[PDB]
Design a protein around this ligand. Structure first.
Ligand code: ANP
Ligand code: MG
Length: 333
């Protein structure tokens, strides 16, 4: 009665995470195509926590947001967790940035605006996405944004945990060589190491708001900090605080007042710079604190409708030629 692995045929691996993989699959009796996310139980939190997260996830499924990938089934065996969801053939934003290097301000405006709406919708339903970054942003067949399935793997990467930095002081970094590289060279290093970073079970705090590592605690506004980091990366080519090691990156994040700068040779608008600085400041004055409308009325979103954006042409046309077209994903061996 309940569906299991045998009811599906794996067609191709289309994504890899630190703690599992995502496959394109075909439901045998129907021929319909789906994405199947597989997570290894041995990498997961304890069974009780996993069960409570899956239970609360069905609230999100029930709400059926435009802005979250549609999830149809979930099952498990002794090894793995499985989630069957709609296949979104536009690929993820990390891979898109890999192919384009940077986006125009108009392209950026579009993706950020849709992501503002996506993040706000999960916040309205009581969820904090504590891992906003380009590999966790998907594009559907019309090029519009959806959040991939989230919640189970939050904070599991070693470098995403406070404990990882225990005896490391918050003093300024020391990678003076790296720091004095031109922007183009920073961008190249970031790109060269990007995929490995996504698959790493260690990772970095490049996208994590500073208060997340503070004893003081944090709130839903941490997501807006992450979005700001993504916005900077879309325009400049790498997130503001990237380094050769997660330790330096952490030091750069904690010292954002000194380390968050725009390279002199890179073209970026005054509006874009201002918004990035409103996203990436201390949470008490961070844009969005009194409500999402403060974000939406930012001068950088000047042309944005915000009622009809998801119902109008997307910034970039997804070029696919079949419903099982995997050309917007990397190959996996
Ligand atoms: N529904 C989907 N349609 C198409 N590709 C997908 C889909 N879900 C995931 N992928 C691909 O697989 C990649 C990784 O899946 P992802 O959902 O991020 O799992 P994860 O990274 O292993 N765990 P998590 O920390 O929860 O994100 C994505 O960024 C895509 O490239
Ligand atoms: Mg992921």
């Amino acid at each position: 009665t309940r569906l299991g692995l045998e009811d599906f045929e794996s067609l191709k691996v289309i994504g890899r995470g630190a703690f599992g993989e995502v496959r394109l699959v075909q439901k045998k009796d129907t021929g319909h195509v789906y994405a199947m996310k597989i997570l290894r139980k041995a990498d997961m939190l304890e069974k009780e926590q996993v069960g409570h997260i899956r239970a609360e996830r069905d609230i999100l499924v029930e709400a059926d947001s435009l802005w979250v990938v549609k999830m149809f089934y979930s099952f498990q065996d002794k090894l793995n967790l499985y989630l069957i969801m709609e296949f979104l053939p536009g690929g993820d934003m990390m891979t898109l940035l890999m192919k384009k290097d940077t986006l125009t301000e108009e392209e950026t405006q579009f993706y950020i605006a849709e992501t503002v709406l996506a993040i706000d919708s999960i916040h309205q339903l009581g969820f904090i996405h504590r891992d906003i970054k380009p590999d966790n942003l998907l594009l559907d067949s019309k090029g519009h944004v959806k959040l991939s399935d989230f919640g189970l793997c939050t904070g599991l990467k070693k470098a995403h945990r406070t404990e990882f930095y225990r005896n490391l002081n918050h003093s300024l970094p020391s990678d003076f060589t790296f720091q004095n590289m031109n922007s183009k060279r920073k961008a190249e290093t970031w790109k060269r190491n990007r995929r490995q970073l996504a698959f790493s079970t260690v990772g970095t705090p490049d996208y994590i708001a500073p208060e997340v590592f503070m004893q003081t605690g944090y709130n839903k506004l941490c997501d807006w900090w992450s979005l700001g980091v993504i916005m900077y990366e879309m325009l400049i080519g790498y997130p503001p605080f990237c380094s050769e090691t997660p330790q330096e990156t952490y030091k750069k994040v904690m010292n954002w007042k000194e380390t968050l700068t725009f390279p002199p040779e890179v073209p970026i608008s005054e509006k874009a710079k201002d918004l990035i600085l409103r996203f990436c400041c201390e949470w008490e004055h961070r844009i969005g604190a009194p409500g999402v409308e403060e974000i939406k009325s930012n001068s950088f979103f000047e042309g944005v409708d915000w009622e009809h954006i998801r119902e109008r042409p997307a910034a970039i046309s997804i070029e696919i030629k079949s419903i099982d077209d995997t050309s917007n994903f990397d190959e996996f061996p």
